[PDB]
Design an enzyme around this catalytic site. Structure first.
Site, mmCIF file in Angstrom:
data_model
loop_
_atom_site.group_PDB
_atom_site.id
_atom_site.type_symbol
_atom_site.label_atom_id
_atom_site.label_comp_id
_atom_site.label_asym_id
_atom_site.label_seq_id
_atom_site.Cartn_x
_atom_site.Cartn_y
_atom_site.Cartn_z
ATOM 1 N N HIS A 1 0.739 -1.314 -0.026
ATOM 2 C CA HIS A 1 0.008 -0.175 0.016
ATOM 3 C C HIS A 1 0.851 1.310 -0.051
ATOM 4 C CE1 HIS A 1 -3.732 -2.055 1.263
ATOM 5 N NE2 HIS A 1 -3.107 -2.978 1.635
ATOM 6 N N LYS B 1 -8.815 14.181 4.622
ATOM 7 C CA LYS B 1 -7.927 13.011 4.811
ATOM 8 C C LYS B 1 -6.950 13.095 5.825
ATOM 9 C CE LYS B 1 -6.987 14.079 0.306
ATOM 10 N NZ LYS B 1 -7.267 12.834 -0.453
ATOM 11 N N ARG B 2 -5.959 12.217 6.296
ATOM 12 C CA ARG B 2 -5.125 12.602 7.072
ATOM 13 C C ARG B 2 -4.200 13.714 6.774
ATOM 14 N NH1 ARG B 2 -4.349 8.554 11.420
ATOM 15 N NH2 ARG B 2 -2.586 10.020 11.993
ATOM 16 N N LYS C 1 0.059 14.583 0.960
ATOM 17 C CA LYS C 1 -0.974 14.901 0.585
ATOM 18 C C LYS C 1 -1.205 16.408 0.124
ATOM 19 C CE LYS C 1 -3.118 10.974 3.167
ATOM 20 N NZ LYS C 1 -3.561 10.054 2.132
ATOM 21 N N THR D 1 -8.817 6.327 -1.669
ATOM 22 C CA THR D 1 -10.263 6.179 -1.671
ATOM 23 C C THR D 1 -11.164 6.968 -1.394
ATOM 24 O OG1 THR D 1 -10.072 5.111 0.627
ATOM 25 C CG2 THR D 1 -9.708 3.464 -1.026
ATOM 26 N N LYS E 1 -15.130 7.995 -3.104
ATOM 27 C CA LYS E 1 -16.414 8.403 -2.295
ATOM 28 C C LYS E 1 -16.945 9.719 -2.859
ATOM 29 C CE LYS E 1 -14.087 6.475 1.679
ATOM 30 N NZ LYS E 1 -13.232 6.879 2.980
HETATM 31 O O1 CKZ Z 1 -4.834 1.107 -0.387
HETATM 32 C C1 CKZ Z 1 -5.371 1.495 0.894
HETATM 33 C C2 CKZ Z 1 -4.750 2.974 1.097
HETATM 34 O O2 CKZ Z 1 -3.459 2.760 1.879
HETATM 35 C C3 CKZ Z 1 -2.789 3.852 2.259
HETATM 36 C C4 CKZ Z 1 -1.546 3.315 3.165
HETATM 37 N N1 CKZ Z 1 -0.470 2.940 2.641
HETATM 38 N N2 CKZ Z 1 0.211 2.758 3.817
HETATM 39 C C5 CKZ Z 1 -0.496 2.880 4.872
HETATM 40 C C6 CKZ Z 1 -0.186 2.770 6.306
HETATM 41 C C7 CKZ Z 1 -1.094 3.014 7.181
HETATM 42 C C8 CKZ Z 1 -0.901 2.884 8.692
HETATM 43 C C9 CKZ Z 1 0.234 2.495 8.993
HETATM 44 C C10 CKZ Z 1 1.774 2.366 8.037
HETATM 45 C C11 CKZ Z 1 1.412 2.607 6.832
HETATM 46 C C12 CKZ Z 1 2.792 2.100 8.722
HETATM 47 C C13 CKZ Z 1 2.214 2.112 10.266
HETATM 48 C C14 CKZ Z 1 3.061 1.890 11.323
HETATM 49 C C15 CKZ Z 1 2.379 1.898 12.587
HETATM 50 C C16 CKZ Z 1 0.976 2.080 12.807
HETATM 51 C C17 CKZ Z 1 0.251 2.413 11.647
HETATM 52 C C18 CKZ Z 1 1.055 2.326 10.284
HETATM 53 N N3 CKZ Z 1 -1.737 3.539 4.555
HETATM 54 C C19 CKZ Z 1 -2.446 4.612 1.231
HETATM 55 O O3 CKZ Z 1 -1.587 5.872 1.509
HETATM 56 C C20 CKZ Z 1 -3.643 4.920 0.340
HETATM 57 O O4 CKZ Z 1 -2.920 5.555 -1.100
HETATM 58 C C21 CKZ Z 1 -4.326 4.006 -0.214
HETATM 59 O O5 CKZ Z 1 -5.439 4.148 -0.825
HETATM 60 C C1 PLP Z 2 -12.037 7.104 2.946
HETATM 61 C C2 PLP Z 2 -11.548 7.400 4.289
HETATM 62 C C3 PLP Z 2 -10.043 7.736 4.501
HETATM 63 C C4 PLP Z 2 -8.913 7.803 3.202
HETATM 64 O O1 PLP Z 2 -9.155 9.117 2.217
HETATM 65 P P1 PLP Z 2 -7.885 9.348 1.226
HETATM 66 O O2 PLP Z 2 -8.388 10.812 0.826
HETATM 67 O O3 PLP Z 2 -7.883 8.255 0.333
HETATM 68 O O4 PLP Z 2 -6.785 9.393 2.083
HETATM 69 C C5 PLP Z 2 -9.612 8.175 5.483
HETATM 70 N N1 PLP Z 2 -10.266 8.627 6.415
HETATM 71 C C6 PLP Z 2 -11.531 8.287 6.509
HETATM 72 C C7 PLP Z 2 -12.291 8.572 7.933
HETATM 73 C C8 PLP Z 2 -12.335 7.830 5.258
HETATM 74 O O5 PLP Z 2 -13.573 7.395 5.498
#
Ligand code: CKZ
Ligand code: PLP
Ligand code: CKZ
Ligand code: PLP
Lengths: 810, 810
Positions: B351, B542-543, B548, B650, B654
């Site tokens: 991811h 988004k976060r 971003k 994602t 939405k």
């Molecule tokens: O496919 C679903 C989504 O995954 C996100 C993601 N890609 N990597 C992470 C991610 C989430 C949480 C944590 C980490 C990576 C590293 C980590 C370390 C410790 C705790 C939580 C996390 N999240 C992507 O940024 C997004 O483009 C994608 O639509």
């Molecule tokens: C869908 C969703 C995300 C992911 O949004 P991105 O714009 O793809 O980062 C994050 N947080 C919440 C609460 C969501 O529903």
């Protein structure tokens, strides 16, 4: 099957079956293909609980509309045991549930065994609180029990290599279907901080907050449709608590540790900060709930007309200064008016005279944890001593003895003195104990305020301790005198008319025999131990403590062994000697006593010359559910504390109700039991309180008894030399040393009379008809020891309310 | 009221009313006199849950009898949000419950707002897992989600003085009616210890044990009567744990901390021991459950025919060496056979390509915590590199790049390399991302094993993200094309036939308008903020992360402000710019970005010359339940990550489903969305991936853009000089410094094109008929982005199972 268990009507059985299946499917989410006995237990428990609900809601609405005086019983312990069978007994559902479960292919007795004890107490004090709740509900009183929901109750005892090991009692692991969380009545409790004095009074500021979340449990009365509440508080951190990030969330544990575990002491005080936090937590949350309920009916003149607070020992004694704090600092009453309300509201029950059991908190702990409460305590003290000085002018030593503040190395607050000063009534728990309080430890207080001092002899509930645990006995009684005795135990006097009735004699002895067979079978199943069920069942079950003199029983057991070995071919009445109870984890001598008992068993039980004439069994994990099994099976009840030490006892009473004879000293309630049954129907021996006093004045010299009693000397030599510990010959030398040089409880001084009196027991047991007649005389005069009697006296003489046997509508 | 919410039949409504009242009385123990809205919420939730039970039991029995291949989706995050409305949607109960509650005097929408989000994830990755569960159930797959039941989920965000503050998300405080504890399927998990090599293999001994207790939550499919299971594990200490006494019981906390709290990072790795423990805990408990279920149908040849394990990123990567450990050490398979089974069973989804997000664990941590797993990893590595060397002989640098073990200062294990080696399939999450994996970070792996590498473009569930959150839109669509599109989203293509239909145009624009009014009212109620609902709603939620590019949006907002101030009497299309999202607690720059956004709002929102032409609102506490409110109300969706950084996204999807137009870069799934709708119907701007590469080769010099774009220079001067922080003029100097000297994400390089493209948005918004026609073209081509499509591809191309739309019987 049996009449006292109620009716099994077709409609009722059909409905119970349907609801059981409903809970199995919807509540537990199982089908019969995958369900275990534990799932069946839960399905039954939910089915029975559904019958409490309407009555619970109706009872609480009734109190709201009638607005009676409310009674708040504040305790750090509620030793409840299991709830399922008790609920069925009190709602008259036992035979119906038996029939319903039988029709579903299940054995209800096996399902009952799955339930965990709610072990939120150490022994007698916690169990007394539980009996009391049962009696208050049965008597129609608007009563609430308030305490702490410990995550871990009294530890589970395992015996390994003959030693006690402790395991956590994770009683909530599978869920508790009896409680209802009430997160909406959550309240804040404050700790630490500092006091600021403004122009507009004192303010307690910069405190740390812990939340108190209540869980409510129903307490059903006996067939009167009254259901009262036990409210137990659980500690929760606030959400901004400590708010790097991860550590701050993990540190919420520090606040939540307040309700984590029951301190496992019985009759032993330690000044630990966590225990003080527990004590304040329960008081602060409780008093807020009380005040809220009072305002929802600032005229506090009427508060003592609508509220009684009963303090179960000094453990909730902070209720006194907390009530003052609320009234003075928050409601702005003047001190004198606040104090009047407080004293009229509070009453204190004392449960012990042993000096090591009395709470005396270091001032430095209160100063840091509860700085405002310490200020209030000092002001109470100064005003109280001003009264003493006016009544006994010049008596400077009296001022020192009566002070709430003890001087010394570390200054301490004597909580018992605080409770006497701030209560309108002070009671002991048996006549001899109440007299001792007036003559010895509280003599000065009694001279100042004699009207405050009362007695309320303890009791036990006959619902749990006869009907539930010994239905066979309940039934044979009911066949003769009807069922009213279950809520009016004095009616057992009518059985004196049956002391010469051959049928009643036979039925009494048959019930005992059945109970003994059932208990012997339980022992083989769960503990791989064989016993002779024709032997006399000689039973001492209670917490392990030097004052209770398990050691005296040990010396008798060894005596009997030695006499068999000396004349192996002489007849002796066979006995099974059973001793059980938990030791506090840090009480070394109590732990050594357990090891001595198992070591004696190791030798006696494997000696082929003894045969099945003598067996010594340590009963592991003694708790309420085990008491319900062993007490009905006992022949002889061992109640052998040194005169002056057991404030009352309540095990004694449970044995008397269930057809055991008693061997005991004139201590605690044993005195009153002997008076009610007649001394001729009790095996009394040993020093009276006055005899103990006389020996203390002269000086107790254990060596004298060793020198004069050859049988005693042989036992001490066997202990010292390694006879009972051949691999570790010095294992018991601390026990020997204590008995010979520093025995506070005078074990050797009662040895000769105890052995002689035990020979009289054996002689009577040889004549079963006469043994059983004596038993009938004990059961028949046990009525005084109903906790319904005890609670009626508290109600009329302390609380100012009238009990009622009237039923609410269903 | 509306058709897609189902039938409200008289019988059904009567039954729902009766069950609601039953749960109020028996389950909650309240009457209507004392019940609060929260009690009403629980009574409804229990009533709806009762409808799941029979289907849940029947579904699990069906899988037992048919024995299909089972799919296990392993994730450290499941971002579920609320469950009540989703359950009603999937069971066709929504209108019936509305009618029942309305008849009882209650508003169901107010009751829905009481439920807590289950916030067991950080953002997109956790939410993808939740969408996936919904799709797997709707497609009739025998699927289980496995994760951790965190006591505290993603923190609640409060904004104080414009700064983020974090509060614990105590989501379980009031109880979770959706889960069922299953203490009977509790399993042990081992930590620490050491390895002994006997003659009969390796043995992992002297370990510390933590128990894993499962809680099961139902996952209903859409109107097919399938209910699958999400099983989340909670950590418990064993009862002999540490077993002075009191401290030993309090120290049970140490073991139970494993499941205490979700690590709140998104796209950022830290090597903390507690997180490693979480990862192993979930894997060890899960794999035991999997094996148990497999044996209850030692022939492991068939294991990959009956089991698929999908790894959601590397977070559960220890499943690979744990499967090997079980098969080799406990089941005694030879290494080669074990490895064959493992590779055929496991598949890995990647991811992210950001290097700081990749898990690389220090060897010393694995050595202490998981010594046997480290041995197995080294053996995997040596065998894997032996294959590399045979395929590319002499290519010594390739051996270093491909190693699972990274050399250096601290040796680390690269978990991504471990997942590729041990899986039969590796996929990215959008076409561009999957291509980047094959060309850049996993190029070497792709050259060795090209057959392993796949794409599975992400999707979202149309149940939560259309029917539930935007029923008005769902309804106007259903009026034209029926209801089948809810489970076959490609049918939305039929709406292209309505692009010139005046009635459909009007209805589409009316629904948006209603959603905007409802959202503007929500903002006034809960946050005291006034907005113009005729303004264009410009939304970036988004976060908060540098990649971003919330900062790029900030620079546009300031540009618009400055242009208004320069020509105050010129018309501009009014906007409400809304930005929301959480920052990780230790990510300083993300926290400063939030403060910048609120500071810009402070100036813009109070400038009387601006008027209601421009408002800037930071939306606090962005979470799933807030996304359901704001996404239906948006006009413009901001998807503006630097090309090459957002693996998919994602949120983008939405917004497209709910009638917002998109402004965005050619990144992640934005590429595919533009391809499906047509580039003419998307606002695309900025550097492509190839353009970013070209700038990196030459060297990015931010100063050049500052020197050439006067409007950009004015903004940097305002930030530097204190215009937005007049009391602390240097407050933003770290943001300025980063933008000017160390911006990895090239914000200034896309500024000019972004501003120009935003002017095109404004121009189109002035022509509502044409804006709405473009919207219709987006909604109509959104069908590809259904997670039902995504899951069907995983099923056929990775798992080897066939989806089904067939209903089970009720
Ligand atoms: O496919 C679903 C989504 O995954 C996100 C993601 N890609 N990597 C992470 C991610 C989430 C949480 C944590 C980490 C990576 C590293 C980590 C370390 C410790 C705790 C939580 C996390 N999240 C992507 O940024 C997004 O483009 C994608 O639509
Ligand atoms: C869908 C969703 C995300 C992911 O949004 P991105 O714009 O793809 O980062 C994050 N947080 C919440 C609460 C969501 O529903
Ligand atoms: O009236 C009911 C019973 O109370 C017992 C008791 N008397 N004091 C205690 C007692 C119990 C628990 C604890 C303490 C005293 C001190 C302490 C400190 C910390 C934790 C628990 C305890 N228990 C008496 O010994 C017994 O004769 C009597 O029948
Ligand atoms: C009744 C009871 C006690 C008190 O017994 P005493 O002999 O009065 O000390 C202690 N523990 C249990 C479990 C009890 O039921």
């Amino acid at each position: 099957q049996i009449s006292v268990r109620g009716l099994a009507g077709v409609e009722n059985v059909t409905e119970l079956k349907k609801n059981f299946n409903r809970h199995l499917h919807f509540t537990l989410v199982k089908d019969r293909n995958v369900a275990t006995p534990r799932d069946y237990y839960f399905a039954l428990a939910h089915t029975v609980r559904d019958h409490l609900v309407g009555r619970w809601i109706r009872t609480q609405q009734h109190y709201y509309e009638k607005d009676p005086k409310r009674i708040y019983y504040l305790s750090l312990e509620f030793y409840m045991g299991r709830t399922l069978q008790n609920t069925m007994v009190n709602l008259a559902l036992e035979n119906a549930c038996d029939e319903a479960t039988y029709q579903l292919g299940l054995d209800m007795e096996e399902l009952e065994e799955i339930e965990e004890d709610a072990g939120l107490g150490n022994g007698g004090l916690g169990r007394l609180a539980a009996c009391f709740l049962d009696s208050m509900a049965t008597l129609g009183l608007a009563a609430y029990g308030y305490g702490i929901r410990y995550e871990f109750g009294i530890f589970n005892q395992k015996i390994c290599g003959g030693w006690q090991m402790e395991e956590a009692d994770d009683w909530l692991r599978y869920g508790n279907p009896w409680e209802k969380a009430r997160p909406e009545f959550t309240l804040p409790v404050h700790f630490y901080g500092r006091v600021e004095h403004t122009s507009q009074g004192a303010k307690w500021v910069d405190t740390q907050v812990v939340l108190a979340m209540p869980y409510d449990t129903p307490v059903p009365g006996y067939r009167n449709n009254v259901v009262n509440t036990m409210r137990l508080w659980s500690a929760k951190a606030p959400n901004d608590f400590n708010l790097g990030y991860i550590q701050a969330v993990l540190d919420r544990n520090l606040a939540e540790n307040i309700s984590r575990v029951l301190y496992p002491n019985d009759n032993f005080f330690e000044g630990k900060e966590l225990r003080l936090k527990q004590e304040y937590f329960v008081v602060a949350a409780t008093l807020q709930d009380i005040i809220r309920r009072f305002k929802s009916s600032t005229n506090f003149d009427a508060f003592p007309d609508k509220v009684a607070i009963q303090l179960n020992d000094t453990h909730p004694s902070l209720a006194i200064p907390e009530l003052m704090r609320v009234l003075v600092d928050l409601e702005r009453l003047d001190w004198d008016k606040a104090w009047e309300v407080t004293v009229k509201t509070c009453a204190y029950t004392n449960h012990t005279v042993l000096p090591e059991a009395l709470e005396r908190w270091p001032v430095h702990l209160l100063e840091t944890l509860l700085p405002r409460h310490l200020q209030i305590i000092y002001e109470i003290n100064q005003r109280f001593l001003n009264r003493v000085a006016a009544a006994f002018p010049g008596d400077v030593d009296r001022l020192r003895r009566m002070s709430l503040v003890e001087e010394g190395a570390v200054k301490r607050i004597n909580m018992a003195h605080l409770c006497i000063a701030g209560s309108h009534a002070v009671n002991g728990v048996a006549r001899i104990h109440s007299e001792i309080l007036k003559k010895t430890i509280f003599k000065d207080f009694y001279e100042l305020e004699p009207h405050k001092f009362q007695n309320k002899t303890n009791g036990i509930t006959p619902r749990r301790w006869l009907v539930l645990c010994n239905p066979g006995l309940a039934e044979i009684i009911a066949e003769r005198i009807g069922e009213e005795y279950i809520s009016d135990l004095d009616q057992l006097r009518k059985l004196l008319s049956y002391v010469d009735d051959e049928a009643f004699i036979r039925d009494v002895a048959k019930v005992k025999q059945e109970n003994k067979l059932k208990f012997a079978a339980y022992l083989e199943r769960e503990y791989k131990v064989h016993i002779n069920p024709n032997s006399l069942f000689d039973v001492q079950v209670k917490r392990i403590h030097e004052y209770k003199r398990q050691l005296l029983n040990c010396l008798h057991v060894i005596t009997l062994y030695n006499r068999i070995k000396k004349e192996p071919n002489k007849f002796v009445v066979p006995r099974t000697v059973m001793i059980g109870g938990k030791a506090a984890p840090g009480y070394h001598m109590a732990k050594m006593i357990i090891k001595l008992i198992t070591a004696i068993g190791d030798v006696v039980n494997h000696d082929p010359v003894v045969g099945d004439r003598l067996r010594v069994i340590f009963l592991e994990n003694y708790r309420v559910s085990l008491a319900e099994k062993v007490i009905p099976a006992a022949d002889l009840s061992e109640q052998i504390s040194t005169a002056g030490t057991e404030a009352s006892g309540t095990g004694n009473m449970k044995f008397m109700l269930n057809g055991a004879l008693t061997i005991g000293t004139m201590d605690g309630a044993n005195v009153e039991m002997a008076e009610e049954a007649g001394e001729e129907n009790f095996f009394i021996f040993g020093m009276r309180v006055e005899d103990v006093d006389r020996l203390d004045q002269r000086g107790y010299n254990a060596q004298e008894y060793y020198d004069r009693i050859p049988e005693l000397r042989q036992i001490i030599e066997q202990l010292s030399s390694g006879f009972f510990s051949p691999k570790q010959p010095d294992l018991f030398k601390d026990i020997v040393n204590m008995l010979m040089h520093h025995d506070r409880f005078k074990v050797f001084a009662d040895y000769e009379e105890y052995v002689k009196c035990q020979e009289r027991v054996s002689a009577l047991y040889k004549n079963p008809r006469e043994w059983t007649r004596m038993v009938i005389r004990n059961i028949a005069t046990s009525g005084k020891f109903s906790s319904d009697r005890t609670i009626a006296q508290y109600a009329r003489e302390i609380w100012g309310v009238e009990p009622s046997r009237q039923r609410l509508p269903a």
